[PDB]
Amino acid sequence: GLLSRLRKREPISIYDKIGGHEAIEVVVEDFYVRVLADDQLSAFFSGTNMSRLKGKAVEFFAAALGGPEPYTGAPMKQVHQGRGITMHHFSLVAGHLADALTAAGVPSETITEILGVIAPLAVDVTSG
Amino acid sequence: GLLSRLRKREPISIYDKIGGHEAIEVVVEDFYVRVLADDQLSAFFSGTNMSRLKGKAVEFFAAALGGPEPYTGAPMKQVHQGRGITMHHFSLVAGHLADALTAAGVPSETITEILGVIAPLAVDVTSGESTT
Ligand code: HEM
Ligand code: HEM
Ligand SMILES: [C-]#N
Ligand SMILES: [C-]#N
Ligand code: NA
C-alpha cells in the first residue's frame, strides 16, 4: 500500500491524496448519479450496462490517477467515437466529476489537478 | 465541531456566527413555510418532495456560509434551469430567506452579510430578467 510505497521513496499520487480505491468508488458512484440525472446526458447511456460501466470507470480513474490497479476496459477513443458527444457534453460531464469530487470533500486545488489529467481526454471522447 | 476547528486554527465562519447546523435547520424550515405560502412561488414546488429539498437546502446554506461539510446536491444553475425563474421570483425568495433569518434573531448586519453570499446566486438561478 502507500506505506510500502513511501518506504521505497515512491511519490504520493493523486489516487493516494484523495483516499485511494474506497474514495474512487464513492466519487464514481456519485458521478453517475449526477450524469444520469442530467437530462442533457442521460440518453447517451440508454443502451449502457451501468453496473459494468461503473466498475470500469472505477478502474479507469484509479489507474489514471496513479493507483496500483489496472484499467481493464476498452480504449477511450474506440468507446466514445461515433457517439455524437460534443465538447458541450464533455464539459457537462467534467462538471459532474468536479461536483462529485467536491461532494466527497476533495480540496478544490486537487480537483483542478484532476481536471488537468482529464481535460486532454476530450480529444478521444468528443466529435463536435 | 467548532471546538476542534479552533484548536486547529481554522477561522470562525458565518455558519458559526448564526449558530451552525442547528440554526440552519430551523431557518430552512421557516424559509419554506414562507415560500410555500407565497402564491407567486408555490406552484414551482408542486410535486416536490419537500423533506428531501429541505435536506439539500440545509447542506447548501451551511456550506455557502463557510460550514465544515461539503454541499452534496445538484449545482444551482443546473437544478433551476428550464424553469423560467425570474429576477422577481429570486428577489421574493431572498426576501423570505432574510425574514426567516430575522425571525430566528440573526443580527441585521449578519443577514446583510448572508445576502451578500446569496445575491450573486441570481445568475445561476434565474432564466428571466423581469422584476415584473
Ligand atoms: C470525462 C472523461 C470521460 C472518461 C474518463 C470516460 C470513461 C469511460 C469508460 C472507462 C468507459 C467504459 C469503457 C468500456 O466499456 O470498456 C466509458 C464508456 C462510455 N462513455 Fe465515457 N468517459 C468520459 C466522457 C464521456 C462523455 C462526455 C460521454 C457522453 C456524454 C460518455 C459516454 C459514454 C458511454 C455512453 C459509455 C458506454 C458505452 C457502452 O454502453 O458500452 N463518456 N467511458
Ligand atoms: C436563494 C437562492 C436559491 C437557492 C440557494 C436554492 C437552492 C436550491 C437547492 C439546494 C435545490 C435542490 C437541489 C438538489 O435537488 O440537489 C433547489 C431546487 C429547486 N429550487 Fe431552488 N434555490 C434558490 C432559488 C429558487 C427560486 C427563486 C425558485 C423559484 C421560485 C426555486 C425553486 C426551486 C425548485 C422548483 C427546485 C426543484 C425542487 C425539486 O426537487 O422538485 N429556487 N434549489
Ligand atoms: C462514461 N461515463
Ligand atoms: C429552492 N428552494
Ligand atoms: Na464507439
UniProtKB/Swiss-Prot annotation, chain B:
The keyword Cytoplasm does not apply. It holds the Pfam family Bac_globin. Heme binds at H80. Keywords: Heme, Iron, Metal-binding, Oxygen transport, Transport. Binds 1 heme group per subunit. Its cofactor is heme. One of its GO terms (molecular function) is heme binding. The keyword Metal-binding applies. Binds oxygen cooperatively with very high affinity. Belongs to the truncated hemoglobin family. Group I subfamily. Homodimer. This is Group 1 truncated hemoglobin GlbN. It comes from Mycobacterium tuberculosis (strain CDC 1551 / Oshkosh). The lineage of its organism: Bacteria, Bacillati, Actinomycetota, Actinomycetes, Mycobacteriales.
